[PDB]
Amino acid sequence: RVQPTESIVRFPNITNLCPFGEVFNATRFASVYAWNRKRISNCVADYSVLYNSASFSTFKCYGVSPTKLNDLCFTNVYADSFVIRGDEVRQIAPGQTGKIADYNYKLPDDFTGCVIAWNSNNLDSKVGGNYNYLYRLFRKSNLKPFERDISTEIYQAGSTPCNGVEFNCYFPLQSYGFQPTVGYQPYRVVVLSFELLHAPATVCGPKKSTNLVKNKCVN
Amino acid sequence: QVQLVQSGSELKKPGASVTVSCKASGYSFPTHAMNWVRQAPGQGLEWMGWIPTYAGFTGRFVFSLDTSVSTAYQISSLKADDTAVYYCARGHVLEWFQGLVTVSS
Amino acid sequence: VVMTQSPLSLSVTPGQPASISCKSSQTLLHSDGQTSFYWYLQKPGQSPQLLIYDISSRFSGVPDRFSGSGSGTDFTLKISRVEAEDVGVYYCMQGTQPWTFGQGKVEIK
Numbered sequence A: 001r002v003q004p005t006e007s008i009v010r011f012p013n014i015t016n017l018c019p020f021g022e023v024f025n026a027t028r029f030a031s032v033y034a035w036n037r038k039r040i041s042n043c044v045a046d047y048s049v050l051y052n053s054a055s056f057s058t059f060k061c062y063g064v065s066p067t068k069l070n071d072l073c074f075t076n077v078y079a080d081s082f083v084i085r086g087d088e089v090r091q092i093a094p095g096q097t098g099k100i101a102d103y104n105y106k107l108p109d110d111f112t113g114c115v116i117a118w119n120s121n122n123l124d125s126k127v128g129g130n131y132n133y134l135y136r137l138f139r140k141s142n143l144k145p146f147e148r149d150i151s152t153e154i155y156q157a158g159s160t161p162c163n164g165v166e167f168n169c170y171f172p173l174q175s176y177g178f179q180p181t182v183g184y185q186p187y188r189v190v191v192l193s194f195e196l197l198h199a200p201a202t203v204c205g206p207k208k209s210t211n212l213v214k215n216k217c218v219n
Numbered sequence B: 001q002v003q004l005v006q007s008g009s010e011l012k013k014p015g016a017s018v019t020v021s022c023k024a025s026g027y028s029f030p031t032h033a034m035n036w037v038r039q040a041p042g043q044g045l046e047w048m049g050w051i052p053t054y055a056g057f058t059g060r061f062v063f064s065l066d067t068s069v070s071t072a073y074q075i076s077s078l079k080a081d082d083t084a085v086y087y088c089a090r091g092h093v094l095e096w097f098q099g100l101v102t103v104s105s
Numbered sequence C: 001v002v003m004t005q006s007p008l009s010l011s012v013t014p015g016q017p018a019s020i021s022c023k024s025s026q027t028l029l030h031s032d033g034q035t036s037f038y039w040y041l042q043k044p045g046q047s048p049q050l051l052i053y054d055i056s057s058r059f060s061g062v063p064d065r066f067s068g069s070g071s072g073t074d075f076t077l078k079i080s081r082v083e084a085e086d087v088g089v090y091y092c093m094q095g096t097q098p099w100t101f102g103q104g105k106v107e108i109k
């Protein structure tokens, strides 16, 4: 065969900064009941910054390797951001057996992305009392990936006759991730879900190099 | 990062109402925690409100606020305290603060 | 008690550290219901940025040169060094104690 002599690097004409910091430097995070799933599109993403941040305790990739990312153009990237408690940090993972993924945030087993989390006990923490983050104890379906179950009602989870009025059927008012103290530490989890070319791509790094000749053996 | 943009100053002799404005970059959200202060004439900064509530003063002030880039603006008379009294702050990212008003000539 | 502060004016050499203290009536409150203490800094009629201090921890914000003995109702900010003319007026803020309140050092000399 004939060895290619030239190459084509053809990237979309994107001039935006790609504000991941508007997800990560936030003063307020959602509880495990819900997340914003902020949509990131049309930007020059650079994941070097998140990967090498000294602020992160974990950066786990299931799909695209952490050492790549900048070389891939995605159609959309979504940021699912919430506060989780230390003992459950790894439990949102495909090993969905610890009673968080099935009542609270569930990562897909075929997740294409990466999960970021960090110790943050100088924020979202208290000297004492309850705080802003609760939990879910039952669902009776064990949830779908990315489902946001925010329905709070007295429910006969225990098959005890709480017919509207309350027992082990009450609200899951757990008070997690802050208790003045692992098992009381907040971690601000951000999950980045990636769309693997299902439309013209809009999110990728700072590359370009071509004349689009189309008449040479090229890479 | 999350820089706030103001307008020019507003000069008025009569006790007419005035409107000011604040603009910024961003995405939509349920969170609404932007706020306002005044540079009081011989005091430090003083807060009028944040979420649409008032600090210890008469509610002659208007919380014209929205989601995303909150179209933040506001008083009915301007009969007192005109010394650049509308600084904008955004307690969402980096606690950014920035800031206007006058009765003269 | 009233978020009052030490009247530091010009008594800092251009190559020296400085400190400013202020007094509150209590120590564990904020605007969001958590613990906090805030600082702002500017000389001219410009916009100071807001720096967050905890009741058990140190911060950094836009500027790096911060430390401070926020040990009790008497809360002190430590200026590691005042770099000559790079000065400004300092204010204390407390969620439950007027949010911003204080007297403001002044200059280097």
Ligand SMILES: *[C@@H]1O[C@H](CO)[C@@H](O)[C@H](O)[C@H]1NC(C)=O
Pocket (backbone or CB within 6 Å): A010, A011, A012, A013
């Ligand atoms: C980038 O711009 C050039 C024209 O300057 C265009 O030919 C190229 O196709 C654009 N990139 C992509 C992926 O379309």
Ligand SMILES: *[C@@H]1O[C@H](CO)[C@@H](O)[C@H](O)[C@H]1NC(C)=O
Pocket (backbone or CB within 6 Å): A020, A021, A022, A024, A025, A049, A050, C061
């Ligand atoms: C968060 O803010 C810091 C400045 O305090 C900045 O260095 C960092 O890059 C920001 N994080 C992201 C993901 O942009």
